[model samples]
Target: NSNICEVCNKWGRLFCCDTCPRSFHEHCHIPSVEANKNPWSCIFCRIKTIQERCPESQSGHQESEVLMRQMLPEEQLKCEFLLLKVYCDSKSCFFASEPYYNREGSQGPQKPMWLNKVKTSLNEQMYTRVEGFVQDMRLIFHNHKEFYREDKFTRLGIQVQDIFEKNFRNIFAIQETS
Candidate 1:
């Protein structure tokens, strides 16, 4: 198929938005694609894309807008902002992380093992204090017909990560099994 720059809407040979799979014309984005590899925040799906494409430092974490404002304390929580670094793929080492496991992956019975384990760990760690919240969130995440949407999951995932990181530090330190 023919390629077009998502930015300037010009013909292109590749999806050059280095941060995203969207391609653009080398001549469209300006001084040529080879001029610089400087970071560029794309405009097509800006906020959502930014949230989707996280940095190495926080790549593993989930960033959410809703959960952050709702769950975190005012002082501790930024203005409707909750940014947590949680893993997405089970293949990653961070998959052992309870929040990460609970935050991502396909919807199916097989997926619950990781999420349930995370919940179980949270229950034991929090002495069930936050178990209900954790369980409900897990259920919501697992059952959402839109679970495949990275943005949706990222939002919820950020909240879960925030909760786990804040409440379960004691249990968090425990080394991973895988």
Candidate 2:
């Protein structure tokens, strides 16, 4: 059961703005139904905000890629780990409880440990050196044959493999017809 609506002062299904404390009944919120699909901003917050762009903002994919290029090897590795985590969270399907219970140490079954390790490798060493990561990822499938049967494991693994080639081929300059 939810509290009374902020706008109508009546009990009903409501949507809460992540940026603001106010809640509005389903029909009370000002944003159109379609506009609410993405990261939503309430009327008050949107009016007050000013947007700025940094050099890396040109492509949202590489907001940190420019900065990473300037970092020492060790620091770049650390940033890669953080980037991998962000990518996993953004994908949503990688974790059983993702996009719902995203906070670290939350209740319910946690994400797989192998997934985390592979993500680290996939982002860190494997990206620049994909053959090793592909073999390592395949070995994970071989070792955990039963567990790998799960949809999340195999599906995300394939996704990683495909993206691995797409992302690295240009960086490493190893061109192939495939």
Candidate 3:
């Protein structure tokens, strides 16, 4: 019954998940919601199903492999959802796409980071531990702060970082470094 994607938050012809109150776009989801998945349940529901299988919280530990082995099914959705929420704010596009916001120092592209890469990393399961993913998210902001002044672009990166930090703690239910 939602008007937009639960991930991208854009107004698209979204696929409504029968079992949950969320809707997603054709490609916005982690596995890219397939049109052929009949009477489909969203990833959120699948996370709950697996959570019942593994009652322990994802916040309690970290691992090497991802949803296929070392990580939980819940964590995959957690990463995907986190990216979706960050993208909800349009400012993320500045970091999301090319004109890729990189530094051109002689040190070989000094810092090569972007929100788009983070999304790709999630899809590829490049994160060894959940914190590995978290680390990259922070770098996008940290690099922004390190490379730019308190200008308009800097403020934009901060906004994306704000969304990242807040939802990160909320989803994983972790403290911001006790």
Candidate 4:
């Protein structure tokens, strides 16, 4: 079997289901390749080649949500609430149109109450859409400064976990206490 995508000439760890004849690297597919052979088809080819809905297209109206479900991270074991956290390590990487690209596309951030709070703080303290917010946090870590420093990968992971936990505890019906 071919180890690469016939369409991309990119080494195949996977194939696009819509264009089953075409291929993609396992890592090349967005949201990652955790699940096995797709029950559905490649969205790219479906949108590109087909004008009419195929028999395979079960819910035409739910198409966007169906695509979203693919992009969203499957909920973890905690099972209290689920979130989709997307970011970029650096500003220069070429953007791919998954549900994760920041600011310029449809799937930037959906949790508005939480995200707006963060955005407001960023605007007041840092400025929206700039990379400095992250860089400054990194600076704090580098300097061993008390303002934002921590032993963990404090610049990133802890801050997000804190926000998620805070929201999870906020739902009135779901008490934080077990």
Candidate 5:
């Protein structure tokens, strides 16, 4: 119903939730042919749907890697939630943007990662393992440090990364202990 997605706060193919008043995209919940007649659930609502039910319920960073990436619904839900955090973290909003690089001059690395790319990739099933997802998430901040070393953007990126890494541990149940 909102002109902008409640989660990303950007205007796009927003699908309203049957549970929440907020509207969102497929990544936030269900992939749509833009369906509306049927009841739709946003990410939060669907997460609650499971909560109304239960639990990667993972070993650790400290031979937990699997032969295939965990594309489990719950796992993707966790990953998507992290992406949501990254998108909302700052007013600078550079996370939605790609870095500008070119042949020469102040041109930087060309393969700058952005939040939207990460989000879409998840919905498109681009991730195989949680670690694979972790690498991409890390790249966003990694690029932040590279693309804007002198600006407040890098500091903002640091804060976002701090929040992400901590939550990632909780989401994956990865123990810091060795």
Candidate 6:
């Protein structure tokens, strides 16, 4: 059946959705269709169809539990550790004594002295983990010289600069192995 394009409101060769009364021009649809692939449905109709077929939204917790169970223990641990790292970094950058925007004011990130206290408090294995983390950070700076350049403003901007300083502070406070 011939119908008007919903987007342009002009008469053209239109494709009608089987599931609904909506019509779209070949070139006017969000994703322009070149061919009819057996079953054709508009965006809205397809979304409704999917929602009806998969009612996972009704049991949100169950879906999360299923997904969590699918992830390996090491994967979960890595994700959790990354989150802690992010939190620490955000805190460090935000509260750094030197203003992130004004890079020339300081030689480098003025790490809080308390970081050393925290490092000494950790057990040998945990201390090694912290040491390794710091070394990885150093490598990142070393590798991305242009990005970490003192004269050049880093791409991350002020918010990230704050996080960088806060990370230094938080990294020192972390004492837990898990």
Best candidate (score: TM-score): 3
Better of 5 and 6 by TM-score: 5
lDDT of 2 at 116: 46
Q: Worst lDDT window (10 residues) for model 4?
A: 71-80
Question: Runs in model 4 with CA error above 4 Å?
Answer: 1-3, 6-8, 16-19, 48-50, 54-178
- TM-score (all chains, Cα) for each model: 0.20, 0.28, 0.74, 0.24, 0.68, 0.30
Two-way lDDT contest, 2 vs 3, winner: 3
Order of models, best lDDT first: 3, 5, 6, 2, 1, 4
RMSD of 2: 14.0
In model 4, the Cα lDDT at residue 64 comes to 27
Which number leads on lDDT?
3
* Per-residue lDDT value at 86 in model 3: 80
lDDT values for all models: 0.37, 0.41, 0.70, 0.32, 0.66, 0.41
lDDT of 2 by residue, 1-178 (tens): 2376554456666666667775556544433223444556544344334212233222233323333343344333333333232233333234312123233433422323343455555445444433334444344334333345553544655654444445443332333452
The window of 10 residues in a row where model 5 has the poorest summed lDDT is 59-68
Please write out the lDDT profile of model 6 over residues 55-138, one tens digit for every residue.
Answer: 652332322233233224322233223323433343333222323323444444433322222223221223224334344334
Q: Which pairs of residues collide in model 5?
A: 69-128, 69-129
What's the lDDT for candidate 1? 0.37
The candidate, 4 or 5, that scores higher on lDDT is: 5
Give me candidate 5's TM-score against the actual structure: 0.68
Better of 2 and 6 by TM-score: 6
Sorted by TM-score (best first), the order is 3, 5, 6, 2, 4, 1
Q: Report each candidate's C-alpha RMSD, comma-separated, in the order given.
A: 16.0, 14.0, 4.2, 17.5, 4.5, 17.4
Residues 27-127 of candidate 1: C-alpha lDDT, one tens digit per residue = 33322245554665333334344434543322232233223323222212121111111222222222233432244555533444244344343324332
